[PDB]
Amino acid sequence: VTLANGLTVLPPLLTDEMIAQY
Amino acid sequence: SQSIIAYTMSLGAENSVAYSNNSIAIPTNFTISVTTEILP
Ligand SMILES: *[C@@H]1O[C@H](CO)[C@@H](O)[C@H](O)[C@H]1NC(C)=O
Numbered sequence: 121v122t123l124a125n126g127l128t129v130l131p132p133l134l135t136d137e138m139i140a141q142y
Numbered sequence: 143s144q145s146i147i148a149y150t151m152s153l154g155a156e157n158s159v160a161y162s163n164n165s166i167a168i169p170t171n172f173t174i175s176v177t178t179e180i181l182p
Contacts, residue, residue, distance in 0.1 A: 138151055 134151075138153060141153060
């Protein structure tokens with residue numbers, strides 16, 4: 121999966137490691 | 143002393159189940175419980 125003035129990208133609360141562990 | 147604290151995520155309780163050859167578990171008693179589901 122290929123990823124991609126006041127605009128900020130908030131990180132997700134659930135990290136990839138914790139999603140993988142789930 | 144009380145203040146704001148920061149901790150990593152509680153992924154949940156860790157449960158130890160043992161997969162075994164020719165071994166089985168079957169519930170002996172049972173419990174009946176009602177749960178609330180709310181839909182606007
Ligand atoms: C099953 O659980 C109930 C409590 O929910 C208990 O009173 C009852 O004795 C239990 N049955 C057996 C056979 O242990």
